Amino acid sequence: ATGSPVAECVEYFQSWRYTDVHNGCADAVSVTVEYTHGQWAPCRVIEPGGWATFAGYGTDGNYVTGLHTCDPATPSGV
């Protein structure tokens, strides 16, 4: 309700250099993340209840600040 960055059911946490977005909508949703700079990862689809690792606020990274809902387009869908 309060934090609504993407499909809602997806929830990230910041564990140093690991922004774990755990979805729970029961459906696949594409989520993107906006970093303090941009370590290139602002679009990845989630599996129902799955995760999406994103370069957290590490010194070798940036810091994801906001999640965004992505449209059906994963980087390399083989």
Alpha carbon distances (Å) from 77 to 43, 50, 59, 72: 12, 17, 29, 10
CATH number of 1-78: 2.60.40.20
Domain-wise residue ranges, the chain: 1-78
The structure's method of determination equals NMR
To the nearest 10°, the Cα dihedral for 36, 37, 41, 44?
Answer: 40
Alpha carbon distance 51, 48 (integer Å)? 9
User: Which residue, 25, 44, 24, is CA-closest to 34?
Assistant: 44
Alpha carbon distance 34, 68 (integer Å)? 7
Alpha carbon distance 21, 11 (integer Å)? 5
Angle (CA) 7-16-13 rounded to 5° is 25
